[PDB]
Amino acid sequence: HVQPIPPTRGIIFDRNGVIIADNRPSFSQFVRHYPLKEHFAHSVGYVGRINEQELKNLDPINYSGTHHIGKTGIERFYESELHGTVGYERTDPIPGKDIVLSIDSRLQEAAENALAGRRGAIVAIQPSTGDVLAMVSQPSYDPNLFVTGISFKAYAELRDSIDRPLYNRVLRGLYPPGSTVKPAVALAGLDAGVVTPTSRVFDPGYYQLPNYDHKYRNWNRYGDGWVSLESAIYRSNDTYFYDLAHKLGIDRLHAFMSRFGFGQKVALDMFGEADGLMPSREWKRKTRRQVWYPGETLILGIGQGYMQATPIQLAQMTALLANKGHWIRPHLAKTIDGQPPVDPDPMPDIVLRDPANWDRVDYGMQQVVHGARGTARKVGATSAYLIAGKSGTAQVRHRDHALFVGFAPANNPQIAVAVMVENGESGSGVAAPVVKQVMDAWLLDEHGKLKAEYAEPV
Ligand SMILES: *C(=O)N1C[C@H](NOS(=O)(=O)O)CC[C@H]1C(=O)NNC(=O)[C@@H]1CCNC1
Ligand SMILES: [Cl-]
């Protein structure tokens, strides 16, 4: 008599080879094991028993003897590769393909530590390679409770908590990116030619389009005076980008911010990534069926309105500013079966008509943290490396979310981080120190100094 044999699920490693997912022996068959538990619930995901629906959507041959299936995260997206082929009693089953993740969990743990128990999300990207060095969504849960079947009570402890431990804030958490988009908006205006690196704008504390008497007010009521590209970035002036978005138009704004990855998903291998929203004139005609008003473009110049962005879309934009426009999609899976995965649908690189604008916007982001009048100047006083970042706030009872993106070292980008702290208020005061703690753990040795590898200038 012949009898089928199930295959063993592929092992999951981090970027340094620490095991993220084993298989443990049980009797009356292997169970999947997550030896780091909550530190990867939203990155790797988990597996569970196979339901009524997914059984009529799986090979009865290859999945014979396989009673569990990927549910979310990496286990699902690469369920095919991690599964394998069955054997027969001896045709031996070929074990599932092993996956090496890009995440360094010495940075994943340091990021969760930097979040300090607050609800939110942290995403770290290596801009030259696209490796997702960290993917953090707080709070967490133990993925080892669904592998065997989770008690309908313990599920409720997850489901009926208002902190939402099941919410993957990195992938399905959509927030108005706020002031953090202003570097990309500046590049949109600089590219079109409506604004030049030295062209000035007087800030009386408000902006009016040449038709209405209505005033679009600056976050500083009394104004910043004459502001240029750099002054507009390290002070995050709203009137400068009110004026920039006006002279640019939403037709060429939505097109530019789309090439930065806003609108649809950015990553290569992230299950259930929300597209986000980059509003255009065609969207509002479909969705709301009303003509686009020129006042709706000005709120977009400072990252507001109906615009929706996921914390990974933000981090990819941060890596893009670090990468000088070379488009490489973020990806968790570093290698599959020992070779890196290939992007089937790449994104075109962002080729500016004056490539020096990259260094000018980066220098504006650079003075955000280190300038004498930067919003996050206190963060730069405690730094051993140059940080080209920018703080912001998201729009929302309770307060509003604090945001801060940034890459470092500014002159040789090795890390790109985007942080969203729920109800943090001060992008400069809470979200900025979290980036610097995440960036510190990646760049600093264990004695507080910058690593030898990253110090040399290029
Ligand atoms: C961007 O989101 N803004 C710029 C400020 N810089 O962030 S931080 O606090 O330095 O870290 C933060 C506030 C936010 C802002 O409010 N910008 N201005 C507006 O939204 C209009 C002025 C008041 N009504 C809207
Ligand atoms: Cl200030």
Side-chain angles (χ1 to χ4, degrees):
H1 204 11
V2 73
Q3 179 244 292
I5 305 151
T8 80
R9 196 163 182 84
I11 311 295
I12 301 184
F13 302 89
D14 86 318
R15 79 178 285 105
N16 285 319
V18 316
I19 321 189
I20 305 304
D22 315 342
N23 301 306
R24 276 305 177 264
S26 290
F27 311 100
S28 210
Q29 184 196 231
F30 277 93
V31 71
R32 185 79 134 161
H33 174 47
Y34 301 110
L36 277 161
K37 307 175 111 158
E38 68 282 337
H39 297 321
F40 270 97
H42 298 282
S43 325
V44 174
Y46 52 83
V47 288
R49 308 148 296 98
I50 297 162
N51 256 340
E52 281 255 302
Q53 305 79 23
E54 48 207 351
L55 192 81
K56 314 187 90 114
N57 250 314
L58 284 163
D59 188 10
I61 297 175
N62 216 93
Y63 274 78
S64 204
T66 293
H67 289 157
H68 299 352
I69 189 88
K71 300 302 185 188
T72 185
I74 292 288
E75 299 270 59
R76 196 207 227 258
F77 198 101
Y78 291 113
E79 169 67 45
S80 323
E81 294 77 8
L82 286 167
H83 181 240
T85 57
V86 279
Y88 293 98
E89 277 188 318
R90 188 199 219 259
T91 287
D92 272 293
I94 316 157
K97 284 178 210 167
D98 309 330
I99 298 176
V100 193
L101 301 173
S102 322
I103 293 178
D104 190 52
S105 310
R106 311 129 83 237
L107 198 77
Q108 193 98 337
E109 263 216 65
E112 302 183 61
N113 190 18
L115 215 41
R118 287 272 205 126
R119 305 169 16 193
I122 296 174
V123 178
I125 298 201
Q126 190 159 71
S128 76
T129 59
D131 290 0
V132 176
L133 305 172
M135 178 193 198
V136 185
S137 187
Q138 216 67 14
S140 302
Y141 59 85
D142 198 346
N144 292 292
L145 314 179
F146 314 84
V147 62
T148 38
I150 183 176
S151 324
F152 74 130
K153 185 199 323 296
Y155 188 76
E157 278 182 54
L158 291 184
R159 183 195 65 239
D160 310 339
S161 161
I162 56 60
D163 274 16
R164 286 197 278 173
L166 285 203
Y167 203 70
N168 198 325
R169 313 186 141 77
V170 169
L171 302 191
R172 305 170 189 90
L174 305 114
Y175 314 95
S179 302
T180 65
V181 296
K182 286 170 179 199
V185 181
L187 281 179
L190 283 163
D191 194 58
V194 302
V195 197
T196 71
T198 324
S199 77
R200 51 147 85 101
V201 160
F202 192 75
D203 170 33
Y206 50 85
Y207 174 78
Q208 298 172 307
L209 53 95
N211 274 34
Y212 276 70
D213 314 46
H214 188 245
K215 285 141 107 84
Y216 299 81
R217 305 183 162 279
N218 198 33
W219 76 266
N220 178 29
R221 258 44 181 186
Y222 315 129
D224 277 310
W226 298 104
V227 307
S228 305
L229 162 67
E230 320 86 78
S231 190
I233 298 205
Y234 61 68
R235 286 234 55 83
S236 187
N237 190 272
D238 299 314
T239 59
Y240 180 99
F241 298 89
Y242 286 152
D243 178 80
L244 192 145
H246 190 57
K247 299 198 277 258
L248 177 68
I250 199 43
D251 285 328
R252 304 179 305 184
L253 176 57
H254 152 88
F256 197 95
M257 305 297 284
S258 203
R259 307 218 306 266
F260 261 72
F262 297 111
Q264 52 188 20
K265 62 225 283 187
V266 283
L268 175 58
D269 45 22
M270 285 186 185
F271 178 70
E273 205 195 322
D275 278 319
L277 181 60
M278 188 37 196
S280 98
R281 182 175 329 263
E282 317 283 47
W283 165 85
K284 196 177 143 124
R285 211 56 147 120
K286 297 193 328 290
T287 303
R288 318 275 169 99
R289 196 233 50 209
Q290 37 189 128
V291 82
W292 189 271
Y293 304 105
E296 288 178 314
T297 316
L298 320 179
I299 66 194
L300 271 171
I302 63 171
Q304 264 139 24
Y306 319 105
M307 187 190 189
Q308 308 245 31
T310 58
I312 171 67
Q313 270 168 349
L314 274 89
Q316 175 49 38
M317 161 205 160
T318 320
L320 222 37
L321 293 163
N323 226 10
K324 306 301 189 56
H326 188 12
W327 245 108
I328 306 160
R329 299 196 160 186
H331 51 109
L332 298 146
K334 201 167 166 58
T335 83
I336 313 285
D337 218 24
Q339 39 197 22
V342 301
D343 187 10
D345 181 57
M347 281 225 77
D349 299 331
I350 301 161
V351 197
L352 268 46
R353 281 141 48 178
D354 181 22
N357 281 332
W358 293 107
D359 281 351
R360 293 193 260 260
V361 162
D362 288 3
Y363 186 73
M365 296 180 70
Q366 197 171 127
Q367 299 300 107
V368 172
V369 183
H370 293 280
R373 270 178 328 206
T375 58
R377 52 173 171 275
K378 317 212 204 156
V379 185
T382 54
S383 179
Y385 47 87
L386 290 185
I387 301 157
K390 186 180 191 317
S391 38
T393 55
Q395 321 324 137
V396 195
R397 203 176 40 52
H398 258 306
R399 315 150 160 98
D400 52 30
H401 317 312
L403 269 66
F404 192 98
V405 312
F407 56 94
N411 280 22
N412 50 104
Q414 288 286 333
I415 179 88
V417 186
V419 183
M420 197 278 314
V421 176
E422 284 198 356
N423 312 5
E425 291 266 55
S426 194
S428 54
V430 54
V434 177
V435 185
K436 202 263 180 179
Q437 263 194 20
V438 174
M439 284 181 321
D440 262 6
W442 189 255
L443 269 47
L444 266 49
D445 63 359
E446 299 202 319
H447 263 256
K449 303 157 300 187
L450 178 58
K451 285 186 169 187
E453 318 162 36
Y454 305 132
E456 54 175 9
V458 278

PDB file of all heavy atoms in Angstrom, residues 178-179 217-219 221 236 238 242 302 304 375 391-393 427-428, ligand 1:
ATOM      1  N   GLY A 178       1.236  64.575   6.284  1.00  0.00           N
ATOM      2  CA  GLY A 178       1.549  65.847   6.901  1.00  0.00           C
ATOM      3  C   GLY A 178       2.741  66.528   6.256  1.00  0.00           C
ATOM      4  O   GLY A 178       2.982  66.430   5.049  1.00  0.00           O
ATOM      5  N   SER A 179       3.512  67.229   7.090  1.00  0.00           N
ATOM      6  CA  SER A 179       4.650  68.006   6.616  1.00  0.00           C
ATOM      7  C   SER A 179       5.786  67.139   6.092  1.00  0.00           C
ATOM      8  O   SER A 179       6.700  67.675   5.455  1.00  0.00           O
ATOM      9  CB  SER A 179       5.171  68.907   7.737  1.00  0.00           C
ATOM     10  OG  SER A 179       4.159  69.778   8.209  1.00  0.00           O
ATOM     11  N   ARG A 217      -3.478  79.555   6.504  1.00  0.00           N
ATOM     12  CA  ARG A 217      -2.593  80.090   7.526  1.00  0.00           C
ATOM     13  C   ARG A 217      -1.410  79.168   7.795  1.00  0.00           C
ATOM     14  O   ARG A 217      -1.502  77.945   7.661  1.00  0.00           O
ATOM     15  CB  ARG A 217      -3.376  80.340   8.816  1.00  0.00           C
ATOM     16  CG  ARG A 217      -4.574  81.242   8.593  1.00  0.00           C
ATOM     17  CD  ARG A 217      -5.326  81.552   9.872  1.00  0.00           C
ATOM     18  NE  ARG A 217      -6.187  82.719   9.696  1.00  0.00           N
ATOM     19  CZ  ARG A 217      -5.763  83.978   9.772  1.00  0.00           C
ATOM     20  NH1 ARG A 217      -4.489  84.237  10.031  1.00  0.00           N
ATOM     21  NH2 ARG A 217      -6.613  84.981   9.594  1.00  0.00           N
ATOM     22  N   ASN A 218      -0.288  79.778   8.166  1.00  0.00           N
ATOM     23  CA  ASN A 218       0.935  79.068   8.502  1.00  0.00           C
ATOM     24  C   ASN A 218       0.863  78.560   9.939  1.00  0.00           C
ATOM     25  O   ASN A 218       0.130  79.095  10.775  1.00  0.00           O
ATOM     26  CB  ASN A 218       2.146  79.986   8.318  1.00  0.00           C
ATOM     27  CG  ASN A 218       3.457  79.225   8.220  1.00  0.00           C
ATOM     28  OD1 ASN A 218       3.510  78.115   7.695  1.00  0.00           O
ATOM     29  ND2 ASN A 218       4.529  79.833   8.718  1.00  0.00           N
ATOM     30  N   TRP A 219       1.635  77.505  10.224  1.00  0.00           N
ATOM     31  CA  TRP A 219       1.674  76.993  11.589  1.00  0.00           C
ATOM     32  C   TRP A 219       2.253  78.011  12.561  1.00  0.00           C
ATOM     33  O   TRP A 219       1.953  77.949  13.759  1.00  0.00           O
ATOM     34  CB  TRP A 219       2.475  75.688  11.652  1.00  0.00           C
ATOM     35  CG  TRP A 219       3.965  75.870  11.576  1.00  0.00           C
ATOM     36  CD1 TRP A 219       4.742  75.812  10.455  1.00  0.00           C
ATOM     37  CD2 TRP A 219       4.859  76.134  12.668  1.00  0.00           C
ATOM     38  NE1 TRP A 219       6.061  76.027  10.779  1.00  0.00           N
ATOM     39  CE2 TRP A 219       6.158  76.228  12.130  1.00  0.00           C
ATOM     40  CE3 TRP A 219       4.683  76.304  14.044  1.00  0.00           C
ATOM     41  CZ2 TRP A 219       7.276  76.483  12.923  1.00  0.00           C
ATOM     42  CZ3 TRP A 219       5.795  76.558  14.829  1.00  0.00           C
ATOM     43  CH2 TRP A 219       7.075  76.645  14.266  1.00  0.00           C
ATOM     44  N   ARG A 221       1.770  81.785  13.246  1.00  0.00           N
ATOM     45  CA  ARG A 221       0.800  82.804  12.854  1.00  0.00           C
ATOM     46  C   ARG A 221       1.476  84.073  12.350  1.00  0.00           C
ATOM     47  O   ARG A 221       0.958  84.730  11.439  1.00  0.00           O
ATOM     48  CB  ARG A 221      -0.142  83.112  14.016  1.00  0.00           C
ATOM     49  CG  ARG A 221      -1.513  82.450  13.878  1.00  0.00           C
ATOM     50  CD  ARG A 221      -1.379  80.995  13.432  1.00  0.00           C
ATOM     51  NE  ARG A 221      -2.667  80.328  13.270  1.00  0.00           N
ATOM     52  CZ  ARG A 221      -2.807  79.033  12.999  1.00  0.00           C
ATOM     53  NH1 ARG A 221      -1.734  78.265  12.858  1.00  0.00           N
ATOM     54  NH2 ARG A 221      -4.015  78.505  12.868  1.00  0.00           N
ATOM     55  N   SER A 236       9.811  74.108   8.006  1.00  0.00           N
ATOM     56  CA  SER A 236       8.541  73.579   7.513  1.00  0.00           C
ATOM     57  C   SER A 236       7.489  74.683   7.407  1.00  0.00           C
ATOM     58  O   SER A 236       6.448  74.666   8.066  1.00  0.00           O
ATOM     59  CB  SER A 236       8.049  72.440   8.404  1.00  0.00           C
ATOM     60  OG  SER A 236       6.902  71.823   7.843  1.00  0.00           O
ATOM     61  N   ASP A 238       4.467  76.569   5.750  1.00  0.00           N
ATOM     62  CA  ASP A 238       3.331  76.108   4.961  1.00  0.00           C
ATOM     63  C   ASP A 238       3.051  77.016   3.770  1.00  0.00           C
ATOM     64  O   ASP A 238       2.630  76.529   2.716  1.00  0.00           O
ATOM     65  CB  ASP A 238       2.083  75.991   5.839  1.00  0.00           C
ATOM     66  CG  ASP A 238       2.259  75.004   6.979  1.00  0.00           C
ATOM     67  OD1 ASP A 238       2.767  73.892   6.730  1.00  0.00           O
ATOM     68  OD2 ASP A 238       1.894  75.341   8.124  1.00  0.00           O
ATOM     69  N   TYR A 242       2.224  76.093   0.150  1.00  0.00           N
ATOM     70  CA  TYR A 242       0.968  76.614  -0.377  1.00  0.00           C
ATOM     71  C   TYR A 242       1.196  77.273  -1.731  1.00  0.00           C
ATOM     72  O   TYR A 242       0.475  77.010  -2.700  1.00  0.00           O
ATOM     73  CB  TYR A 242       0.359  77.620   0.601  1.00  0.00           C
ATOM     74  CG  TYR A 242      -0.268  77.028   1.844  1.00  0.00           C
ATOM     75  CD1 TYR A 242      -0.328  77.760   3.023  1.00  0.00           C
ATOM     76  CD2 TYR A 242      -0.808  75.749   1.840  1.00  0.00           C
ATOM     77  CE1 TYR A 242      -0.900  77.236   4.165  1.00  0.00           C
ATOM     78  CE2 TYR A 242      -1.386  75.215   2.980  1.00  0.00           C
ATOM     79  CZ  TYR A 242      -1.428  75.965   4.140  1.00  0.00           C
ATOM     80  OH  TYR A 242      -1.998  75.447   5.281  1.00  0.00           O
ATOM     81  N   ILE A 302       1.252  70.664   1.601  1.00  0.00           N
ATOM     82  CA  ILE A 302       1.794  70.390   2.922  1.00  0.00           C
ATOM     83  C   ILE A 302       1.335  69.024   3.432  1.00  0.00           C
ATOM     84  O   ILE A 302       1.410  68.750   4.628  1.00  0.00           O
ATOM     85  CB  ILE A 302       1.447  71.511   3.915  1.00  0.00           C
ATOM     86  CG1 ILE A 302      -0.064  71.617   4.112  1.00  0.00           C
ATOM     87  CG2 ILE A 302       2.015  72.841   3.436  1.00  0.00           C
ATOM     88  CD1 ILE A 302      -0.453  72.549   5.236  1.00  0.00           C
ATOM     89  N   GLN A 304      -1.848  67.236   3.190  1.00  0.00           N
ATOM     90  CA  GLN A 304      -3.134  67.066   3.853  1.00  0.00           C
ATOM     91  C   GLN A 304      -4.244  66.751   2.859  1.00  0.00           C
ATOM     92  O   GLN A 304      -3.988  66.190   1.788  1.00  0.00           O
ATOM     93  CB  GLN A 304      -3.485  68.317   4.660  1.00  0.00           C
ATOM     94  CG  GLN A 304      -3.101  68.213   6.122  1.00  0.00           C
ATOM     95  CD  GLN A 304      -2.508  69.494   6.664  1.00  0.00           C
ATOM     96  OE1 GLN A 304      -2.754  70.576   6.133  1.00  0.00           O
ATOM     97  NE2 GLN A 304      -1.718  69.378   7.725  1.00  0.00           N
ATOM     98  N   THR A 375      13.599  72.480  13.198  1.00  0.00           N
ATOM     99  CA  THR A 375      12.545  72.061  14.114  1.00  0.00           C
ATOM    100  C   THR A 375      13.048  70.997  15.080  1.00  0.00           C
ATOM    101  O   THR A 375      12.625  70.960  16.241  1.00  0.00           O
ATOM    102  CB  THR A 375      11.338  71.544  13.332  1.00  0.00           C
ATOM    103  OG1 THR A 375      11.740  70.451  12.498  1.00  0.00           O
ATOM    104  CG2 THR A 375      10.755  72.650  12.465  1.00  0.00           C
ATOM    105  N   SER A 391      10.423  66.326  10.273  1.00  0.00           N
ATOM    106  CA  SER A 391       9.319  65.976  11.147  1.00  0.00           C
ATOM    107  C   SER A 391       7.998  66.467  10.571  1.00  0.00           C
ATOM    108  O   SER A 391       7.951  67.336   9.696  1.00  0.00           O
ATOM    109  CB  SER A 391       9.526  66.569  12.541  1.00  0.00           C
ATOM    110  OG  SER A 391      10.094  67.866  12.466  1.00  0.00           O
ATOM    111  N   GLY A 392       6.913  65.891  11.077  1.00  0.00           N
ATOM    112  CA  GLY A 392       5.584  66.306  10.680  1.00  0.00           C
ATOM    113  C   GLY A 392       4.558  65.802  11.668  1.00  0.00           C
ATOM    114  O   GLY A 392       4.883  65.162  12.671  1.00  0.00           O
ATOM    115  N   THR A 393       3.301  66.107  11.365  1.00  0.00           N
ATOM    116  CA  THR A 393       2.160  65.689  12.163  1.00  0.00           C
ATOM    117  C   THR A 393       1.103  65.132  11.224  1.00  0.00           C
ATOM    118  O   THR A 393       0.938  65.624  10.103  1.00  0.00           O
ATOM    119  CB  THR A 393       1.580  66.842  12.995  1.00  0.00           C
ATOM    120  OG1 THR A 393       1.259  67.941  12.137  1.00  0.00           O
ATOM    121  CG2 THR A 393       2.583  67.300  14.042  1.00  0.00           C
ATOM    122  N   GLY A 427       6.098  66.005  16.265  1.00  0.00           N
ATOM    123  CA  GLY A 427       6.968  65.276  15.362  1.00  0.00           C
ATOM    124  C   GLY A 427       8.428  65.550  15.665  1.00  0.00           C
ATOM    125  O   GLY A 427       9.284  64.678  15.538  1.00  0.00           O
ATOM    126  N   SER A 428       8.729  66.774  16.063  1.00  0.00           N
ATOM    127  CA  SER A 428      10.074  67.170  16.450  1.00  0.00           C
ATOM    128  C   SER A 428      10.487  66.673  17.839  1.00  0.00           C
ATOM    129  O   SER A 428      11.696  66.567  18.095  1.00  0.00           O
ATOM    130  CB  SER A 428      10.193  68.669  16.381  1.00  0.00           C
ATOM    131  OG  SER A 428       9.179  69.272  17.144  1.00  0.00           O
TER     132      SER A 428
HETATM  133  C1  LIG B   1       3.126  69.721   9.113  1.00  0.00           C
HETATM  134  O1  LIG B   1       2.409  68.788   9.297  1.00  0.00           O
HETATM  135  N1  LIG B   1       3.090  70.857  10.034  1.00  0.00           N
HETATM  136  C2  LIG B   1       4.376  71.596  10.327  1.00  0.00           C
HETATM  137  C3  LIG B   1       4.822  71.510  11.787  1.00  0.00           C
HETATM  138  N2  LIG B   1       6.216  70.909  11.857  1.00  0.00           N
HETATM  139  O2  LIG B   1       6.173  69.624  12.500  1.00  0.00           O
HETATM  140  S1  LIG B   1       6.981  69.754  13.987  1.00  0.00           S
HETATM  141  O3  LIG B   1       6.001  70.067  15.098  1.00  0.00           O
HETATM  142  O4  LIG B   1       8.088  70.783  13.920  1.00  0.00           O
HETATM  143  O5  LIG B   1       7.762  68.488  14.301  1.00  0.00           O
HETATM  144  C4  LIG B   1       3.905  70.711  12.635  1.00  0.00           C
HETATM  145  C5  LIG B   1       2.490  71.106  12.486  1.00  0.00           C
HETATM  146  C6  LIG B   1       1.981  70.903  11.062  1.00  0.00           C
HETATM  147  C7  LIG B   1       1.018  72.035  10.745  1.00  0.00           C
HETATM  148  O6  LIG B   1       0.126  72.255  11.488  1.00  0.00           O
HETATM  149  N3  LIG B   1       1.181  72.871   9.531  1.00  0.00           N
HETATM  150  N4  LIG B   1       0.231  73.908   9.328  1.00  0.00           N
HETATM  151  C8  LIG B   1      -1.177  73.576   9.113  1.00  0.00           C
HETATM  152  O7  LIG B   1      -1.535  72.443   9.094  1.00  0.00           O
HETATM  153  C9  LIG B   1      -2.226  74.737   8.913  1.00  0.00           C
HETATM  154  C10 LIG B   1      -1.928  75.841   9.988  1.00  0.00           C
HETATM  155  C11 LIG B   1      -3.084  75.701  11.064  1.00  0.00           C
HETATM  156  N5  LIG B   1      -4.120  75.181  10.377  1.00  0.00           N
HETATM  157  C12 LIG B   1      -3.472  74.258   9.183  1.00  0.00           C
END
